[PDB]
Amino acid sequence: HHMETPLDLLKLNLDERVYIKLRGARTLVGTLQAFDSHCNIVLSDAVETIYQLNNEELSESERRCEMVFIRGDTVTLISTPSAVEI
Amino acid sequence: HHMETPLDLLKLNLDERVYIKLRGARTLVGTLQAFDSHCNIVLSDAVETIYQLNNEELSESERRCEMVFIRGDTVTLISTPSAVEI
Amino acid sequence: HHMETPLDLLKLNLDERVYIKLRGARTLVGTLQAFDSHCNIVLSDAVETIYQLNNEELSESERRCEMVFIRGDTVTLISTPSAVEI
Amino acid sequence: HHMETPLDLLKLNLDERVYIKLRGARTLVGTLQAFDSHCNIVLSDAVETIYQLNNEELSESERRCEMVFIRGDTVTLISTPSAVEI
Amino acid sequence: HHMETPLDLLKLNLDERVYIKLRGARTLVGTLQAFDSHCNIVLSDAVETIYQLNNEELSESERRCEMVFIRGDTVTLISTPSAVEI
Amino acid sequence: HHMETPLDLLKLNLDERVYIKLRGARTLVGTLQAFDSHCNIVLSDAVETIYQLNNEELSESERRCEMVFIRGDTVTLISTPSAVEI
Amino acid sequence: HHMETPLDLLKLNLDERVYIKLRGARTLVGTLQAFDSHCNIVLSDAVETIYQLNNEELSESERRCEMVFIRGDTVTLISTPSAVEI
Amino acid sequence: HHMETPLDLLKLNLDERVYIKLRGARTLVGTLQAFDSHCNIVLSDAVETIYQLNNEELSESERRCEMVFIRGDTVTLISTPSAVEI
């Protein structure tokens, strides 16, 4: 078994598509550009998810931007992106 | 790959339009003037979003101001821009 | 670009009218007299907003006082005060 | 402009009537006797506000006491005064 | 004006009846026997208030004991005990 | 007056019956065996109170055990005793 | 009276059946294998309790596993396991 | 009895299937690749559980990904395994 820290393994994602979940299950998708030890993260080509309310209709949408700085202590998961029917 | 911290990349926005999302999805827009390591922020030419309630009608509006100091531990995202139907 | 910290830029408001939002969107308005690094603030000529309940009628009012000491960690925003119709 | 800390200005209230607002808008009134850097406070001649419930009737009253120690991290505001219809 | 700290003034209550309010407005009454700098407190001849539920009937009662050790960070107020009608 | 800390007075209960109230008014009873400065506690001959739900019927019961370790930052009160109708 | 710390007394449970309650009253049962000073715990032969929802029917079940690592700051109680009718 | 820390025993799972429970009972399954002392974790071959809402129908599903970084202070349990009806 290798001896790589969690942060060491996260390096493997630099410049790859990454999917980020924050407090209360809010999601972002983007290219991992940077991170630090508190886990602040910067994505490029990001897609933020926007939750919406109009009466009871909690619909949901996408906000696209060049670059997003995510404050570290709201991050809960960083995952890599996500065929026969018998 | 380059070796810039999250905060290093955030410098790239100094004096640019920046969109800020706080705890519970409150938003501000403005020119990034200043920031520090706790992530306290200052915007100039800011537009704060104002939520309102009158009966069930949670309408919503825009409060424009010369300068805004945003206390760092309410910030969740700082993004580059994504105003008028012609 | 200047090299002024967030707190440095806040100095620019000393003795100016300032609008302060606290936890859960409670507002105060007043003349900035003092602040420290934890962000305790003193206003003079302050106007606190008072939220009221009588049945469902969440009305709202103004409490005027000579001087207000605001405990730092409840502060979320400090902004400067806030014409043709085509 | 003068160079007094928030806490320096709070000294100006020693031995004066002072109105205190806690977490969730509970109030006290009293003479400021003492304070420290965590903002623990002592008032003498205090009047605590007492909220009550009997069915839906959230009435409200006044508990008068010689001296009150207010634990500092529940304080949100300390204000100078703003009792009887004649 | 004297130069007594909040804790210094609390000493004045040693062996006196004292009324204590905790997080969420729970009350105790008793003789102040001890306290430390975190504000742990010991009362003797204490009367705790007991809140009760039976259907909607949130009634309320008194639990009397020789001695109570109160964990410091739940304490919000310590007050001294609380006549003509024109 | 004597000069004992809260924790000094709590020693007086070692090996005595002690009643403990946690966050949100959960109770335990038992012999005080041990404690430390974070207020972690150990009781022997303990009786934990068990709350139950079946439809609306929030009934309540007793779980008896040889020894119980109570994590210190859930403790709010430790009291000396105040079981059977004959 | 012995001079054993809370953690010292917990040692007495190594390799014994132990019942663990976490934040919000979630329960686990198992053989105590390890613990550290932050109170991380490892059980073997564990039985986790699984709470379930299907309409209003908050039923409840058991998930059995070889070994469970419990993160320290969610632990609230560790107790030892729990006859004539007059 | 042996003298292994909780974290020492957690090593035994490196490269094994591991089931993880977060705050509020969100689950992940995957191969343990890495961990650190705050308990940040990395799994490979992970299966995140995805909760969904459409009217009242809180259905539930599986998001499969190459690698997942789980921020340590959301982890509550890490367990060894307990998929198909034939």
CB nearest to A66's CB, from B5, B8, B80 = B80
**CB contacts < 8 Å between E and F, how many?**
58
How far lies C55's CA from each of D49, D51, D53, in Å?
A: 20, 16, 14
Interface-testing mutation among A29, A73, A79, with chain H (most H C-beta atoms within 10 A): A79
Q: Work out whether the CA dihedral G37, G38, G42, G43 comes out positive or negative.
A: positive
Judged by a CB distance cut-off of 8 A, whether residue D8 touches chain C is yes
Range(s) of the domain holding residue H57: 1-86
Q: Is-contact H56 A74, C-beta < 8 A? A: no
Report CB contact under 8 Å: F63, G82. Answer: yes
Strand partners, A60: A51
List the one residue out of G28, C76, D86, E61 whose CA is nearest residue B23.
C76
Min Cα distance G34 → chain F (Å) is 15
Q: Is-contact D70 D22, C-beta < 8 A? A: yes
With beta carbons under 8 A apart, name residues in chain C contacting D6. 34-36, 40-42, 69, 72
The experimental method is X-ray
How far is Cα C33 from Cα C78, in angstroms, rounded to an integer?
13
Report CB contact under 8 Å: F79, E64. Answer: no
Q: Is-contact E10 D41, C-beta < 8 A? A: no
With beta carbons under 8 A apart, name residues in chain D contacting E7. 36, 40
Q: Is-contact E18 E80, C-beta < 8 A? A: yes
CB nearest to G66's CB, from H1, H78, H80 = H80
List the one residue out of B43, B32, D6, B34 whose CA is nearest residue C38.
D6
Q: Is-contact G71 G84, C-beta < 8 A? A: no
Q: Is-contact B79 A69, C-beta < 8 A? A: yes
Residue pointed to by tokens 């917990």: G10
Q: Which residue of B has its CA nearest to A16?
A: B1
Strand partners, A44: A31, A67
DSSP B74: G
Which helix (H) or strand (E) element contains residue H11? helix H6-11
Which spans in chain F are helix H?
Answer: 6-11
How far is Cα A9 from Cα H66, in angstroms, rounded to an integer?
12
CATH number for C7: 2.30.30.100
List the one residue out of G29, G36, G33, G27 whose CA is nearest residue G73.
G36
Number of compact structural domains in chain C: 1
Q: Is-contact H13 H77, C-beta < 8 A? A: no
CB atoms within 10 A of CB E24: 11
How far is Cα H18 from Cα H8, in angstroms, rounded to an integer?
16
Q: Is-contact D62 D49, C-beta < 8 A? A: yes
Q: Is-contact E46 E33, C-beta < 8 A? A: no
Resolution of this entry, Å: 2.5
List the one residue out of F31, B6, G39, F21 whose CA is nearest residue A10.
B6
The residues, ordered by sequence, that sit 6+ positions from F85 with a Cβ below 8 Å of its Cβ are none
List the one residue out of F75, F25, F77 whose CA is nearest residue F49.
F25
The 3-class secondary structure across chain A, one letter per residue, is CCCCCHHHHHHCCCCCEEEEEEHHHCEEEEEEEEECCCCCEEEEEEEEEEECCCCCCCCEEEEEEEEEEECHHHEEEEECCCCCCC
With beta carbons under 8 A apart, name residues in chain A contacting H36. 5-7
Residue pointed to by tokens 């967030």: C6
State both tokens at F45. Answer: 């001959």
Q: Is-contact C6 B35, C-beta < 8 A? A: yes
Could you tell me which chains touch chain B, where touching means 3 or more CB pairs under 8 A? A, C
Contacts by residues F2-9 (CB-CB < 8 Å, ≥ 24 positions apart): F4/E33, F4/E34, F5/E34, F5/E36, F5/E40, F6/E34, F6/E35, F6/E36, F6/E40, F6/E41, F6/E42, F6/E69, F6/E72, F7/E36, F7/E40, F7/F35, F7/F37, F8/E34, F9/E33, F9/E34, F9/E42, F9/E67, F9/E69
How far is Cα H36 from Cα H72, in angstroms, rounded to an integer?
8
The residues, ordered by sequence, that sit 6+ positions from A47 with a Cβ below 8 Å of its Cβ are A28, A29, A30, A62, A63, A64
CB atoms within 10 A of CB E46: 24
Angle at B22 between CA B21 and CA B25, to 5 degrees: 75
With beta carbons under 8 A apart, name residues in chain E contacting D22. 76
Q: Is-contact C58 C52, C-beta < 8 A? A: yes
How far is Cα B39 from Cα E73, in angstroms, rounded to an integer?
29
Report CB contact under 8 Å: C48, D77. Answer: yes
What does residue E16 show for φ and ψ, rounded to 5 degrees?
-100, 160
User: Would you call D23 helix, strand, or coil by DSSP?
Assistant: helix
Beta strand E60-70 with E41-51 is antiparallel
With beta carbons under 8 A apart, name residues in chain F contacting E28. 77
Q: Is-contact D62 D50, C-beta < 8 A? A: yes
DSSP C25: G
DSSP D31-77: EEEEE-TT--EEEEEEEEEEE--STT---EEEEEEEEEEE-GGGEEE
Residue pointed to by tokens 């024109």: E86
Q: Is-contact D47 D26, C-beta < 8 A? A: no
CB nearest to B42's CB, from C9, C76, C81 = C9
Give exposure, G36-59, as e/b (b: 16+ Cβ within 10 Å): eeebbbbbbebbbeeeeeeeeeee
Report CB contact under 8 Å: H6, G46. Answer: no
Judged by a CB distance cut-off of 8 A, whether residue C74 touches chain D is yes
The residues, ordered by sequence, that sit 6+ positions from G39 with a Cβ below 8 Å of its Cβ are F71, G72, G73, G75
How far is Cα F9 from Cα F12, in angstroms, rounded to an integer?
5
Give exposure, D36-56, as e/b (b: 16+ Cβ within 10 Å): eeebbbbbbebbbeeeeeeee
In the chain, the amino acid numbered B52 is: Q
Report CB contact under 8 Å: E22, F79. Answer: no
Which helix (H) or strand (E) element contains residue B9? helix B6-11
How far is Cα B13 from Cα B18, in angstroms, rounded to an integer?
7
Interface-testing mutation among D77, D78, D80, D82, with chain C (most C C-beta atoms within 10 A): D77
How far is Cα F70 from Cα F20, in angstroms, rounded to an integer?
9
Beta strand E27-35 with E41-51 is antiparallel
**Residues constituting chain C:** 86
Q: Work out whether the CA dihedral H53, H54, H60, H61 comes out positive or negative.
A: negative
Q: Is-contact A47 A29, C-beta < 8 A? A: yes
Min Cα distance C67 → chain D (Å) is 6
Contacts by residues A10-16 (CB-CB < 8 Å, ≥ 24 positions apart): A10/A35, A10/A78, A10/H42, A10/H69, A12/H67, A13/A78, A13/A80, A13/H67, A14/B1, A15/B1, A16/A80
DSSP C46-80: EEEEEE--STT---EEEEEEEEEEE-GGGEEEEE-
How far lies C78's CA from each of A75, B46, D29, D46, H53, in Å?
A: 26, 12, 27, 31, 38
Report CB contact under 8 Å: B70, C76. Answer: yes
In the chain, the amino acid numbered E12 is: L
Angle at D79 between CA D73 and CA D80, to 5 degrees: 145
The residues, ordered by sequence, that sit 6+ positions from E2 with a Cβ below 8 Å of its Cβ are none
Judged by a CB distance cut-off of 8 A, whether residue G51 touches chain H is yes
Interface-testing mutation among C79, C80, C82, with chain B (most B C-beta atoms within 10 A): C79
Distance of alpha carbon C82 from the chain centroid: 12
